[PDB]
Design a protein around this nucleic acid. Structure first.
Ligand SMILES: [Mg+2]
Ligand SMILES: [Mg+2]
Ligand SMILES: [Mg+2]
Ligand SMILES: [Mg+2]
Ligand SMILES: [Mg+2]
Ligand SMILES: [Mg+2]
Ligand SMILES: [Mg+2]
Ligand SMILES: [Mg+2]
Ligand SMILES: [Mg+2]
Ligand SMILES: [Mg+2]
Ligand SMILES: [Mg+2]
Ligand SMILES: [Mg+2]
Ligand SMILES: [Mg+2]
Lengths: 139, 62, 97, 143, 139, 190, 86, 63
RNA sequence: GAGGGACAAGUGGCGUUCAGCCACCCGAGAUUGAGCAAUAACAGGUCUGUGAUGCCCUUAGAUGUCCGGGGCUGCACGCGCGCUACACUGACUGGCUCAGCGUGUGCCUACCCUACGCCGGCAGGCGCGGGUAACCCGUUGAACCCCAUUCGUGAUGGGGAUCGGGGAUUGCAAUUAUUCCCCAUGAACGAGGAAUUCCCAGUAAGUGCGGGUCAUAAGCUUGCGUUGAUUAAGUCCCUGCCCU
């Protein structure tokens, strides 16, 4: 009995494996309170500190990341948690709890459930960036 | 030199050399339906209460 | 025994793979699926002009290389029959025992 | 309860691991490194004088996590940003002699098993060592 | 906590002046000695590098100057020095403060005897390795 | 069920003293969150810039001038230091005095080119309150940056200094300097 | 070459202000008698208000924090934030 | 920019004028009815045709 | 890989039976980036891409061709595209930590990518092993960033050109240029006058990597990512275009 959901930040994906049990967090072998940015070692807490006690106390959630960047991993893990609760409620505890807790998460923020299709633009040939150009030369 | 406050009813259009300014009416809250036409640069919707430093200007255009 | 289909275009690739599966599954051959190797892209970028006048204007050429693997563990006597297909000229076949 | 090395604050862990290397004296630091030696491409020697104990602690940690690495692999683990000056910077490799020095030190001090296609990896001896150290640092964290 | 020690400036090597800012970065002011040679001399003199120049013992200053004038008696191998081996004497040595400009004048003098064009373009108002000189080094 | 708090904070009962800046400062409960760093999608529509919290806006305008471009971790660190300064100095929660500095910062009338298609007198016009919030944050971060350029002071100290001396507009701060300078030019072009 | 420069803004911050690398005993007693009484203690505030080099400021702050007169709030990269009890 | 092309409005008026009968006021049904009664080379063209066909149906059913 | 999914379809408002526009729900997305790209021209550039070519010129003491040096680099100067910088939002030193394009050998005629171990301080060397590739380099352990140390407004340790001495490495040859590394030397430069360029959302900008050239080889160029704003969502004054 387990569900795997994903993160889908920009090029960062967190496989979230939620199994029934007391409540554990494995992020690449390492628990919740130790993440790589000390500053954003509160942003990833937002699903946990927003849901509370008896919900993570009911679900084991482990996270594996082969992502793209530091800040992208934080939002990838964040959205993977917030989707893992959604799919584990679709499998295990009914829609009368699921749609209500989903309404709370969405009325807080849409990006916890909805992935944002914002990838890079391809670097155009004329200039050194995607939009900018080199300096012209007049006299 | 009292300072009055006024909230936007309509937008008459964008005018100026650059199109930067927006001719609008802020009505007057303090008394009855008095409304002058003042220039605002920057974005402005309906329901924006505006800070006026003089309620005696009127630089109208058609 | 595996067969590597490395082709020039996707439609002839799909058609020869469908023909191979249709000529395979009537026998008692346990077939592994047409596994998709990822697309290699050989790119060449070119100045477009013999002399350097005008705006800097670059070509951007691509080829797509497509590759499907299929595993057919059998005696090789059946594979000799499987080899005989009027095959499209844009498809390359490797066989490996 | 169970304390594994990932479950601890990390710079706190190496802060005590370099000390419990100095307690045993599990080190063969021969001559030139004791004299003076720069890093990858650097301008000064490091300040903290026990930096061979520090490099050995970092090497032990990374070989526990990503096993089967070698000299050039850990050389690229350390990571080089070499500001060349006016000409801009690039990724430059670590120094190779210290990279194989720490391997030769931990192999002689019984903390390197050999993955035969590759190189270094963990021993059960070093497993017990690194694990008891992580447990006591976790106890110092809660206490 | 070392409240106050009575020292401002030393006289080292009969020409140079050491301030009071640090020790390892104030030995820098001696010609021929720069970034890393001081950190070699300091760690061979076993001095605590936290101490200022205005707090250090004159016996230890004389020991430092001994390390400065002769490295090879103690350690400090031949590759690290300033005056390499192959010299008008073949001595693996470290050039001094006042001796440095003298060795530079000997370099230019013996290149002017040979009339190697390296020394010739050095005697001209030109750049030796300066491959392009349309724009490099104007005025 | 918890109260949405920044750090150790309450993030609550911050009352904007007047109207004409309500709904352009997102200090309210439906737009108060833990960290300033959020998923920035604030160039999609014109007036959806208002739903950004002003602490995130302060971080965003704080990162400038090439050497500091990007690095939202660094500027959120700066804001975290500055609120810790304002907490120790006189109390009176730093979110409140940030809002007060925004009110007593940005100009309320300016000068610009108007028509008649003749000689432009640089006529004194009003200003959008959105542009007041924007120009407030811009003048605050500009004064903090060029105050902390070349001194022993830090970005944290100069930013907290600028916010406190803007919430108390006692003519020592660069925001009150450019405030009074723009209103004097507007009165001269009146 | 000839010295040509296109801007002229001289007169910097204060004309190479002198600063003491080591605290005298009068300055140290001034520390011990009024650095409690300040509300916030950063190395920058202590340095620019008492004419102290910043490393000497960090040394004195790490001294009196070890006395425990001062109360640390947080420490990070380049900012050191202090208070006094009452 | 729904200023739809001459060929799109031409084929849409031909579709409604030939077969008014099968088309209803439901967009997703009318989309699949277009592939039954016509040959459309592309799916974007299917969607554009079916959208303007439903907008014409909300006029013809009206008046 | 096949297929689906987004059309202004639903609401309301502005709309002439309209064409359509604005605001919002739902959605992943209310439209992203390119490619291709008309009629007619320039007396635009390439005879130095061609065994594509007319005519002229030269053809044995050659303007053909090799071969040995030298040179396009040579500096009282002016101009263009850029890189590094002018430091405390920072440098130094240690620790922690995550990518994506794509490249790689006996090749239609001359050609590698590197794993491991040991020596050496480093550039490097020696044996051994793999890869004609989702198999091996390579779960590309990149930089930026983050944590900790030192430096403390000082041409300072910012700045790293100038240049003395040496050491590897390619090569047939580096000297009036290779390249890389160590020590030393430590200038101008204090955010830049007149003017001008580029830019609207994963956008400018910081940052590193891969390819092209190549043996040695990037500050160029071309793709990739990584961290990631400010201000617009408007007009025709300035530059310039399209229709009466
Ligand atoms: Mg810049
Ligand atoms: Mg055309
Ligand atoms: Mg020819
Ligand atoms: Mg040339
Ligand atoms: Mg020039
Ligand atoms: Mg150009
Ligand atoms: Mg430097
Ligand atoms: Mg200097
Ligand atoms: Mg220009
Ligand atoms: Mg830079
Ligand atoms: Mg290259
Ligand atoms: Mg190459
Ligand atoms: Mg080039």
């Amino acid at each position: 009995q387990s569900v795997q959901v994903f993160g889908r930040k920009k090029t960062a994906t967190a496989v979230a494996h939620c199994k029934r049990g007391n409540g554990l967090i494995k992020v690449n072998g390492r628990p919740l309170e130790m993440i790589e940015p000390r500053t954003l070692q509160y942003k990833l807490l937002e699903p946990v500190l927003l849901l509370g006690k008896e919900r993570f106390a009911g679900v084991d959630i482990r996270v594996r990341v082969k992502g793209g960047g530091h800040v992208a991993q934080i939002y990838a893990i964040r959205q993977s948690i917030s989707k893992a609760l959604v799919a584990y409620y679709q499998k295990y505890v009914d829609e009368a709890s699921k749609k209500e807790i989903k309404d709370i998460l969405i009325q807080y923020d849409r990006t916890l459930l909805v992935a944002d299709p914002r990838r890079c633009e391809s670097k155009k040939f004329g200039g050194p960036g995607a939009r900018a150009r080199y300096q012209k030369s007049y006299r | 030199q009292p300072i009055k406050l006024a909230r936007v009813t309509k937008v008459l259009g964008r005018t100026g050399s650059q199109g930067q300014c927006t001719q609008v009416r802020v009505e007057f809250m303090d008394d009855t339906s008095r409304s002058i036409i003042r220039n605002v640069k920057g974005p402005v919707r309906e329901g924006d209460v505006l800070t006026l430093l003089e309620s005696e200007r009127e630089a109208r255009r058609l | 025994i595996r067969i590597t289909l490395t082709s020039r275009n996707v439609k002839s690739l799909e058609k020869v793979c469908a023909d191979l599966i249709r000529g395979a599954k009537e026998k008692n051959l346990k077939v592994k699926g047409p596994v998709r190797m990822p697309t290699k892209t050989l790119r060449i970028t070119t100045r477009k002009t013999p002399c350097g006048e005008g705006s800097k204007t670059w070509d951007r050429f691509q080829m797509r290389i497509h590759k499907r693997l299929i595993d057919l563990h059998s005696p090789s006597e059946i594979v000799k029959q499987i080899t005989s297909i009027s095959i499209e000229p844009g498809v390359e076949v490797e066989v490996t025992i | 309860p169970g304390v594994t090395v990932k479950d601890v604050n990390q710079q706190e862990f190496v802060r005590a691991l370099a000390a419990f290397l100095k307690k045993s004296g599990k080190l063969k630091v021969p001559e030139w490194v004791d004299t003076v030696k720069l890093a990858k491409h650097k301008e000064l020697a490091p300040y903290d004088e026990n930096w061979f104990y520090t490099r050995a602690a970092s090497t032990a940690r990374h070989l526990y996590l990503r096993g089967g690495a070698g000299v050039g692999s850990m050389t690229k683990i350390y990571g080089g940003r070499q500001r060349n000056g006016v000409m801009p910077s690039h990724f430059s490799r670590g120094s190779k002699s210290v990279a194989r020095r720490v391997l030769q030190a931990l192999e002689g001090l019984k903390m390197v098993e050999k993955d035969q296609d590759g190189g270094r990896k963990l021993t059960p001896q070093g497993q017990r060592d690194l694990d008891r150290i992580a447990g006591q640092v976790a106890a110092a964290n809660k206490k | 906590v070392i409240p106050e020690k009575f020292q401002h400036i030393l006289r080292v090597l009969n020409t140079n002046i050491d301030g009071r800012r640090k020790i390892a970065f104030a030995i820098t002011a001696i010609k021929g000695v720069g970034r890393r040679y001081a950190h070699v001399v300091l760690r061979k003199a076993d001095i605590d590098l936290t101490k200022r120049a205005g707090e250090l013992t004159e016996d230890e200053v004389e020991r430092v100057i001994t390390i400065m004038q002769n490295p090879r008696q103690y350690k400090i191998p031949d590759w690290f020095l300033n005056r390499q081996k192959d010299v008008k004497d073949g001595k693996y040595s470290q050039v001094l403060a006042n001796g440095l400009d003298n060795k530079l004048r000997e370099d230019l003098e013996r290149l002017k005897k040979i009339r190697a064009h390296r020394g010739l373009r050095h005697f001209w108002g030109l750049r030796v390795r300066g491959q392009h000189t349309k724009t490099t080094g104007r005025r | 069920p918890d109260i949405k708090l920044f750090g150790k904070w309450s993030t609550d009962d911050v009352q904007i003293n007047d109207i004409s800046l309500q709904d352009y400062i997102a200090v309210k409960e439906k737009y108060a969150k833990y960290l300033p760093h959020s998923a920035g999608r604030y160039a999609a529509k014109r007036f959806r810039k208002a739903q950004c919290p002003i602490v995130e806006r302060l971080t965003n305008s704080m990162m400038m001038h090439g050497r500091n471009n990007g690095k939202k971790l660094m500027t959120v660190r700066i804001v975290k230091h500055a609120f810790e300064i304002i907490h120790l100095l006189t109390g009176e929660n730093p979110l409140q005095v940030l809002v007060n500095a925004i009110i007593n910062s940005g100009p309320r009338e300016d000068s610009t080119r108007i028509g008649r298609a003749g000689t432009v007198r640089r006529q004194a016009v009003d200003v959008s309150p959105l542009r007041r919030v924007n120009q407030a944050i811009w003048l605050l971060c500009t004064g903090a940056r060029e105050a902390a350029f070349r001194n022993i002071k830090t970005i944290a100290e100069c930013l907290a200094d600028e916010l406190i001396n803007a919430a108390k507009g006692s003519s020592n701060s660069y925001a009150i300097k450019k405030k009074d300078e723009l209103e004097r030019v507007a009165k001269s072009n009146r | 070459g000839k010295a040509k420069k296109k801007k002229w803004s001289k007169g910097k911050v204060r004309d190479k202000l002198n600063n003491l690398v080591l605290f005298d005993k009068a300055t140290y007693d001034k520390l011990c008698k009024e650095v409690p009484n300040y509300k916030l203690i950063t190395p920058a505030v202590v340095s620019e208000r008492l004419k102290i080099r910043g490393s000497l400021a960090r040394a004195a702050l790490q001294e009196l924090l070890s006395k425990g007169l001062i109360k640390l709030v947080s420490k990070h990269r380049a900012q050191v934030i202090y208070t006094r009890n009452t | 920019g729904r200023v739809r092309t001459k060929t799109v409005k031409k084929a849409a008026r031909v579709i409604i004028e030939k077969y008014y009968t099968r088309l209803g006021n439901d967009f997703h049904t009318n989309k699949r009815v277009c592939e039954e009664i016509a040959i459309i080379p592309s799916k974007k063209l299917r969607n554009k045709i079916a959208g303007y066909v439903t907008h014409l149906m909300k006029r013809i059913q009206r008046g």
